Design a protein around this ligand. Structure first.
Ligand SMILES: Nc1ncnc2c1ncn2[C@@H]1O[C@H](COP(=O)(O)OP(N)(=O)O)[C@@H](O)[C@H]1O
Ligand SMILES: [Cl-]
Ligand SMILES: [Cl-]
Length: 386
């Protein structure tokens, strides 16, 4: 009976349920409405979500994340060779050509396929819904990026099966976001929908057409390496240089633990800057027992990220060009992904679309799970959302 919608995200995952036409996004044990797509292995336990992300800087080698960049891929693909520089954990190729993530768990060397790591994230999201409902959950709709190939979709479905879920369907993330806003029901006639999805690691723009309750992905573009983590890195690079000017050329970047601790505080300041004009980045005993403190204005953050923010419009122009349509022909602009909370990004998109207000009523990092939950309820025979 009970079916959930799961956004299996690169950096964060989210679980929703649609009952009586109402969608509840379910909070985890820590009260978080999204859960990090992190899995860590220690001498005693296997941590998933918040607990895994929280100990990442203390256990870099055995804390896995970014499995979505490896799922359904051959280890030899150029994408894997390029991305692996960003991972403190070890990834090797198996005799079947599949990636094998190598960690230490309880003093033993263990290997996992990307779909096994993703199955642990999915199992945690299943448990988050189960704790809320007080009942077991078997059915689910899981989302994937529109550009995911058959191998990536099938490996994501397999991750669901391993997690104990009966995957009703694998659907596209941009389509799930459009379904969340009821754009398939609302009004009538052909509608051109632009989904602007800027998450923690990726940027995806998708141009959809909707005629008679049927969504079609006309064109997609973006950048698989542009997200919130790149804006955090702009703050990290600035702080590293600021520390040098304050402490006679001392270089924080030589210590990877100092960088990780600084990155944690840079991301917190970035979030504050979405609703405040200023924020403080503070790390006690950052490097060589030296305390670090700096005040960052929203203007300074905007300046450090200026080119990256403006360049988000390039894939918007590209999808419009590929779909052979003018920006004036876009009926709805849906903001998806946690980074769309950045005021400058919202302003740039609004100005590009000549003052058109983007649809952002749903928490952008929840809209995909919200749409997947609606689709899960429809596929279970519940027509109340319509
Ligand atoms: N209030 C906020 N302002 C700026 N950035 C924010 C934010 N709230 C969340 N974010 C960013 O959103 C990113 C995560 O986005 P989300 O949509 O949940 O994850 P995902 N797996 O789709 O990448 C992180 O980089 C985080 O810093
Ligand atoms: Cl249901
Ligand atoms: Cl309930």
């Amino acid at each position: 009976e009970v079916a959930i919608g799961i956004d299996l995200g690169t950096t964060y995952s989210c679980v929703g349920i649609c009952r009586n036409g109402v969608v509840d996004i379910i909070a985890n044990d820590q009260g978080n409405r999204t859960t990090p797509s992190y899995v860590a292995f220690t001498d005693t336990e296997r941590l998933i979500g918040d607990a895994a992300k929280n100990q990442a800087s203390r256990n870099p080698e055995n804390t896995v994340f970014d499995a979505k960049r490896l799922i359904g891929r051959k280890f030899s693909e150029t994408t894997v060779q390029s991305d692996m520089k960003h991972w403190p954990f070890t990834v090797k190729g198996g005799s079947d050509g599949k990636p094998m993530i190598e960690v230490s768990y309880q003093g033993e060397k263990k290997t996992f396929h990307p779909e096994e790591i993703s199955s642990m994230v999915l199992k945690k999201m299943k448990e988050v819904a189960e704790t809320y409902l007080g009942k077991p959950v078997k059915n689910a709709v899981i989302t994937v990026p529109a550009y995911f190939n058959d191998s990536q979709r099938q490996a994501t479905k397999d991750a669901g099966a391993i997690a104990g879920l009966n995957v009703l369907r694998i659907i596209n993330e941009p389509t799930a976001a459009a379904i969340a806003y009821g754009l398939d029901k609302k009004g009538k006639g052909e509608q051109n929908i632009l989904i602007f999805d800027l998450g923690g690691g990726t940027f995806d723009v998708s141009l959809l057409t909707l005629e008679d309750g049927i969504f079609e992905v006309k064109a997609t573009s973006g950048d698989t390496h542009l997200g919130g983590e790149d804006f955090d890195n702009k703050l990290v690079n600035f702080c590293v240089q600021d520390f040098k000017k304050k402490n006679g050329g001392k270089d924080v970047s030589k210590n990877s633990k100092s960088l990780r601790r600084l990155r944690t505080q840079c991301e917190k300041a970035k979030r504050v800057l979405s609703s405040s004009a200023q924020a403080t980045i503070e790390v006690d005993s950052l490097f060589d027992g030296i305390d670090y403190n700096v005040n960052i204005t929203r203007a300074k953050f905007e300046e450090l990220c200026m080119d990256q923010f403006r360049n988000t419009l390039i894939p918007v122009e590209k999808v419009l060009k590929d779909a052979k349509m003018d920006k004036s022909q876009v009926h709805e602009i849906v903001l998806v992904g946690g980074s769309t909370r950045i005021p400058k990004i919202q302003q740039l998109i609004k100005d590009f679309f000549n003052g058109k207000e983007p649809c952002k009523a749903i928490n952008p990092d929840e809209a995909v799970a919200y749409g997947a939950a609606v689709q899960a309820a429809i596929l279970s025979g519940d027509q109340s959302s319509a």
